[PDB]
């Protein structure tokens, strides 16, 4: 009858099964097309292992920002803009930190040290 | 003269606001109400914040006495703790999917609004303007 387990390993009675709503299945694509019954079960799975692995091998950490995004192209475009924003709000001294040469004209830190230690500055 | 025993009493109310029964939480809420109205203006606002953390979860409740003492605790706590803190507690559930939660938050925000509708003018969030409306308040961010 497909009746889910209890602690004492029997069928769960029907009004209780309806309450818990096991009928509803969630296609988690990250998890090897794993598919879950039970909604909070589904949700905790996002921090469960199979989802963790899925993430690692996706090439994107299991940080919360993607939890409940289950399709992988959505995940990659999401983490794409997220990447863009992290690189934005990083202060990178290479392109920001900027140096005038002696000659009254300015370059960045990088190029300053570049031409500095390749024999002019 | 509760500004003295407020500290002694808090860990007992937090004790009884983590469940013991309906009547347990109904009564600890009444105590919070009266402490707040007594300690209005003496700076013991950290303690009433701490007890907000424990009273606010009972917001979804049904029994008339229980939810009623809860609402009373929140009016007292509104004068004593200020209306920013309570508008922030009431922000996110104004526009919630559900309707039980939308309704309780609009009940509260109504009572927070009626009394002290005029502070809130400096407490409202910043709500961006889409295409065909203007929603930011540029009045407030003129520099000077």
């Amino acid at each position: 009858k497909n009746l889910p387990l209890g602690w004492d390993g029997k069928p769960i009675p029907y009004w209780l099964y309806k309450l818990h709503g096991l009928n509803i299945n969630y296609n988690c694509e990250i998890c090897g097309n794993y598919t879950y019954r039970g909604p909070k079960a589904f949700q905790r799975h996002f921090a469960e292992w199979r989802h963790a692995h899925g993430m690692r091998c996706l090439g994107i950490p299991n940080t919360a920002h993607f939890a409940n995004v289950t399709q992988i192209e959505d995940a990659v475009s999401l983490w794409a803009k997220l990447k863009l924003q992290k690189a934005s709000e990083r202060w990178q001294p290479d392109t920001e930190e900027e140096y005038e040469d002696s000659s009254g004209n300015v370059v960045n830190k990088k190029t300053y040290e570049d031409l500095k230690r390749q024999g002019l500055l | 003269m509760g500004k003295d025993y407020i500290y002694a009493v808090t860990p007992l109310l937090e004790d009884a606001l983590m469940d013991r029964d309906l009547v347990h939480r109904q009564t600890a809420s009444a105590v919070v109400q009266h402490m707040s109205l007594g300690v209005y203006g003496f700076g013991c606002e950290d303690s009433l914040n701490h007890l907000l953390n424990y009273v606010w979860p009972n917001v979804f409740e049904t029994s008339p006495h229980v939810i009623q003492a809860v609402m009373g605790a929140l009016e007292g706590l509104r004068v004593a703790i200020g209306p920013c803190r309570m508008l922030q507690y009431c922000l996110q559930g104004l526009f919630h999917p559900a309707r039980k939660v939308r309704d309780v938050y609009w009940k509260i925000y109504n009572s927070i609004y009626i009394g002290s509708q005029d502070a809130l003018i400096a407490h409202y969030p910043r709500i961006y303007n889409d295409d065909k409306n203007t929603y930011i308040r540029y009045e407030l961010d003129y520099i000077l």
Partner: protein
């Protein structure tokens, strides 16, 4: 529910309240009107704006009370 007769009398009593279905438009427009009524009432934010732009108190309050009519865009639909 006679409580509700009184309570939508309360909605009729206090312009700016809400109910569980209230729309972002009514909410933010009511807060915008209230903001205006208080910029007028408090004798000093008026100096703040009067001085921020180069206007004068009559100019200031006339703008404000004109804006009070459709402050946050046109309506919802």
């Amino acid at each position: 529910y006679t409580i509700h007769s009184q309570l939508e009398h309360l909605q009729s009593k206090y312009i700016g309240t809400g109910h569980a279905d209230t729309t972002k438009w009514e909410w933010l427009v009511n807060q915008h009107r209230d903001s205006y009524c208080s910029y007028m009432g408090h004798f000093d934010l008026l100096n703040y704006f009067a001085i921020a732009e180069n206007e004068s108190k009559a100019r200031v309050r006339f703008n404000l009370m004109e804006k009070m009519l459709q402050p946050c865009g046109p309506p919802a639909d």
